[PDB]
Design a protein around this ligand. Structure first.
Ligand SMILES: *[C@@H]1O[C@H](CO)[C@@H](O[C@@H]2O[C@H](CO)[C@@H](O[C@@H]3O[C@H](CO[C@H]4O[C@H](CO)[C@@H](O)[C@H](O[C@H]5O[C@H](CO)[C@@H](O)[C@H](O)[C@@H]5O[C@H]5O[C@H](CO)[C@@H](O)[C@H](O)[C@@H]5O)[C@@H]4O)[C@@H](O)[C@H](O[C@H]4O[C@H](CO)[C@@H](O)[C@H](O)[C@@H]4O[C@H]4O[C@H](CO)[C@@H](O)[C@H](O)[C@@H]4O)[C@@H]3O)[C@H](O)[C@H]2NC(C)=O)[C@H](O)[C@H]1NC(C)=O
Ligand SMILES: Cc1cc(OCc2cc(C(=O)N3CC[C@]4(CCOC4)C3)[nH]n2)c(C(C)(C)C)cc1C#N
Ligand SMILES: [Ca+2]
Ligand SMILES: [Ca+2]
Ligand SMILES: [Cl-]
Ligand SMILES: [Cl-]
Ligand SMILES: [K+]
Ligand code: NA
Ligand SMILES: [Zn+2]
Length: 805
């Protein structure tokens, strides 16, 4: 109950709330059905529209008007945004030349440049080029400020997950807004776009920017605007708040437009009907900038123009129906559309089997436009699993398609020509970023980056300490003229041991054999130097990775590779090697096919054993440094050390062997050498973070050898590919992957074919950032380069997406 007969007299768009049953006048009252009786009359004035005309200039104030053209309006802070232009011979901001904003130029009493976040729904990245002729204000912000060619959203590429990621710096799995529809089984409660449960604060985790600011003494304008409040009124409200006295005035503001998304759903991303919504957004930007210029704030405020996601062509006829795959289709609940999430209709029904649902959805039709996954098997780059609100069964839907349960759901519910929500690597889902202001750089293009990074930057713009988040603070310092965050490398927690030769061959009873008794003083001193690290400059190009947790490990040097070997996990944490453009691929000779050799530097008790692998009928083994790339027949023996062995399912060995035999060499040829760091990952609880040993759910049968959930590789070369990877003077180029360690290749529908037809496609799907690997391993890479640490942070956040232009 709200007794709505109090008044909004003087309280219109009040910043601080008042608690029911007092009536409210803030821009959320509409949504609660709790506005005071006179809210529309007082707060939503519309009389005479939004623009001054010549006949209104110097009028007598009439408090009924939507905005004012009277002499006193500037000091009241409520002029129409074009007042100075119509009535005082001023230019619109868009007609003025770009002039570098070297320092903030602010009215007295401003303690810091305000931040205005101008968010646009569905604003696909290519609109910046394709709509350029009709968006002059946006194009000025873009060319004069700092911009990226695009900004990557989070998955799913829906509105609330992305807006709340913008506000928190968190992945959806962590902030808890995991889709536009949700069931939380702890609360036994559902979240929907329509209605009122979506306003309960227990849905929304982490710490959004307005809370961060408020806790640290910085005042915030509202971020949420009710749909009924017209755009012109949102802009006027921001401009009025900017005229408040110093102790009352917010420092951070947001605007939101439901366009161009609204129209894109109806007409597709490039429907002829889309020109008009783009024009109208630009006009709104023009209103804001003219308004700021009138208030002498246009060289004081930092403006961010940012989208939540793009928009793809999607029609009703491109719908896959689960009724064409499953016969039990009424025993499930599907969250449908551009992604799929499946759970049991009833938790009382113990007949429901996820394995058989997954199998009935796997590679069943020749051009099947969705792929089923257990959530823990989704590409780690999506970071879409560690939340009880994410159902175990997930369907990744091809761009341009939908999934639905039954045909009845599509025509008893064609309407739409656009949608979004797909994999965040998809070109059509990419969105925009421009930063314009004293704190941003002038006329500067920056590379594409992920929206999870912006929270830290907005905190930097406001002098705030960010709450813990998934950004990598410092990776976006290159956007900024000043306020840069000066990060430092994390301290190494565990130092390595450097073991020498300590064990005789006969102390090992590993059940391994090798055909290797083949007896020189030139080449005796030679091999000793290699085992003491003589080639380490060649194979370890960026320093050893730092171990950021407490553990016991050994550095092991070899002619062709260096490794950090874990005494706890009985395998390397990391293995590092460099393959030049000129390197030759060789075969594993017949006599060495099953060769495994004890490592006389590492005790029997801290070694793997061959008998376990023999006994484990499901599990085989591979090698981290590939025997195929040995520098010489004699060096090849090092590759068969028991300390280079890792557990691998035979199905996975098909993937790994093709990577190592064909792909590494291809990359070295294409990139002019590569440095490779490879290793295991253990993420049995799918939290994106390195497992402790007591979290491991699977071991090689009858042993303490833990089974990885994934294998990674980080492949680094010179960005200037005229220089070889091992003699690079300037910036680096990286691609990485985190491959799931699976006992079948069910994910790859073409896997019965030769590896040249499906392996590289799988590796692309599981593309990763170095930072993703860092989280999953507790390692810190690139510790010793000639590059600035901020540049290295940017490198560590890079994702190679394998989409065309
Ligand atoms: C991306 O960035 C984020 C942010 O930095 C990273 O997430 C953090 O990761 C930490 C490790 O996983 C995690 O720390 C744990 O927090 C527990 C207390 O947490 C509460 O308070 C914080 C702070 O205010 C709050 O933010 C949390 O909010 C979560 O939960 C509510 C729902 O209840 C949601 O509204 C919200 O969205 C958020 O959910 C997300 O995180 C939780 C985990 O907290 C997930 O379950 C959800 O799925 C969702 O993703 C909390 O309200 C604290 O109790 C933990 O301590 C245990 O573990 C330590 C090990 O050091 C042990 O020593 C302790 O004693 C304790 O163990 C005991 O409890 C165990 C669990 O019951 C029990 O099994 C044991 O036997 C012991 O008795 C722990 O410190 C931190 O909370 C989150 N923060 C957020 C915001 O998610 C994320 O990792 C980054 N991602 C990547 C890929 O890098
Ligand atoms: C900049 C910013 C804005 C923002 O919200 C702006 C907003 C969204 C809506 C709204 O009405 N929506 C959204 C979904 C929809 C549209 C079509 O139909 C469903 C209704 N209104 N205002 C938020 C949140 C976290 C408050 C959402 C965070 C940030 C940040 N950082
Ligand atoms: Ca949206
Ligand atoms: Ca984990
Ligand atoms: Cl959803
Ligand atoms: Cl708000
Ligand atoms: K085996
Ligand atoms: Na297959
Ligand atoms: Zn939409």
């Amino acid at each position: 109950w709200t007794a709505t007969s109090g008044s909004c007299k003087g309280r219109c768009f009040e910043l601080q709330e008042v608690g029911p049953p007092d009536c409210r006048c803030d821009n959320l009252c509409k949504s609660y059905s709790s506005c005071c009786h006179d809210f529309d009359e007082l707060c939503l004035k519309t009389a005479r529209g939004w623009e001054c005309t010549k006949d209104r200039c110097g009028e007598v104030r009439n408090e009924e008007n939507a905005c004012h053209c009277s002499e006193d309006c500037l000091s009241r802070g409520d002029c129409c945004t074009n007042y100075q232009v119509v009535c005082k011979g001023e230019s619109h901001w868009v007609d003025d030349d770009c002039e570098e904003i070297k320092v903030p130029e602010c009215p007295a009493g401003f303690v810091r440049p305000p931040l205005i976040i101008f968010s646009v729904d569905g604003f696909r990245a290519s609109y910046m080029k394709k709509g350029s002729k009709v968006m002059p204000n946006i194009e000025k912000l873009r060319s004069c400020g700092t911009h990226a060619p695009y900004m990557r959203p989070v998955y799913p590429t829906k509105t609330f997950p992305n807006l709340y990621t913008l506000a928190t710096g968190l992945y959806p799995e962590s902030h808890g807004i995991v889709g536009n529809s949700m069931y939380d089984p702890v609360f036994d409660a559902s979240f929907h776009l329509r209605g009122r449960e979506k306003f309960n604060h227990r849905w929304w985790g982490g710490q959004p920017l307005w809370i961060t600011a408020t806790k640290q003494g910085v005042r915030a304008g509202t971020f949420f605007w009710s749909v009924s409040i017209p755009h012109e009124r949102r802009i006027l409200t921001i401009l009025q708040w900017l005229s408040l006295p110093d102790n009352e005035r917010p420092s951070v503001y947001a605007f939101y437009s439901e366009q161009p998304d609204f129209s894109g759903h109806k007409y597709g991303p490039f429907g002829p009907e889309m020109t008009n919504p783009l024009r109208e957004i630009d006009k709104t930007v023009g209103q804001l900038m003219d308004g700021l210029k009138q208030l002498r704030l246009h060289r004081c405020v930092n403006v961010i123009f940012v989208g939540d996601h793009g928009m793809e062509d999607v029609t009703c006829d491109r719908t896959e129906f689960l009724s064409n795959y499953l016969t039990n289709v009424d025993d499930i609940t599907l969250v449908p559309g551009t992604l799929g999430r499946i759970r049991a209709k009833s938790i009382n029904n113990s007949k429901y089997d996820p394995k058989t649902i997954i199998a009935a959805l796997t590679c069943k039709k020749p051009d099947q436009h969705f792929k089923p996954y257990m959530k823990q098997h989704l590409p780690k780059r999506l970071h879409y699993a560690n939340n009880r609100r994410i159902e175990d069964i997930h369907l990744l839907v091809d761009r341009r398609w939908h999934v639905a349960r039954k045909p009845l759901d599509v025509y008893k519910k064609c309407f739409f020509q656009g949608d979004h929500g797909f994999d965040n690597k998809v070109n059509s889902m990419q969105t925009v970023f421009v930063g314009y202001g004293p704190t941003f750089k002038y006329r500067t293009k920056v590379p594409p980056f992920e929206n999870i990074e912006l929270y830290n930057v907005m905190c930097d713009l406001l002098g705030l300490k960010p709450a813990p988040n998934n950004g990598t603070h410092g990776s976006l310092n290159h956007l900024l003229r000043t306020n840069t965050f000066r990060p430092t490398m994390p301290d190494e927690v565990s130092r390595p041991n450097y073991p020498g030769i300590m064990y005789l061959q006969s102390e090992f009873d590993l059940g391994c054999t090798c055909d290797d008794k083949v007896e020189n003083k030139l080449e005796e001193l030679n091999k000793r130097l290699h085992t003491k690290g003589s080639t380490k400059e060649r194979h370890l190009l960026y320093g050893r990775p730092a171990v950021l947790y407490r553990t016991s490990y050994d550095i092991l040097y070899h002619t062709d590779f260096e490794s950090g070997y874990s005494e706890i996990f009985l395998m390397p944490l990391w293995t590092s090697y460099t393959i030049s453009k000129q390197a030759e691929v060789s075969s594993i000779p017949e006599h060495l096919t099953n060769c495994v050799r004890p490592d006389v530097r590492v005790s029997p008790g801290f070694s793997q054993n061959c008998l376990a692998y023999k006994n484990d009928k499901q599990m085989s083994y591979g090698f981290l440094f590939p025997p195929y790339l040995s520098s010489s027949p004699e060096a090849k023996y090092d590759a068969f050390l028991v300390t280079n062995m890792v557990p691998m399912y035979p199905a996975f060995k098909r993937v790994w062997a093709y990577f190592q035999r064909v792909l590494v060499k291809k990359y070295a040829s294409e990139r002019n050498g590569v440095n490779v760091i490879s290793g295991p990952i253990f993420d049995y609880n799918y939290d994106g973070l390195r497992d402790t040993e007591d979290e491991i759910k699977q071991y090689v049968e009858g042993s303490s050898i833990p089974v990885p959930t994934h294998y990674y590789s980080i492949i680094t070369s010179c960005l200037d590919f005229t220089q070889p990877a091992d003699k690079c003077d300037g910036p680096l180029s990286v691609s990485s992957f985190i491959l799931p360690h699976r006992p079948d290749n069910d994910e790859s529908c073409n896997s019965s074919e030769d590896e040249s037809k499906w392996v590289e496609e799988l590796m692309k799907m599981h593309t990763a950032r170095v930072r993703d690997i860092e989280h999953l391993t507790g390692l810190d890479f690139y510790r010793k380069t000639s590059r600035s640490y901020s540049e290295i942070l940017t490198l560590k956040t890079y994702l190679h997406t394998y989409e065309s232009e």
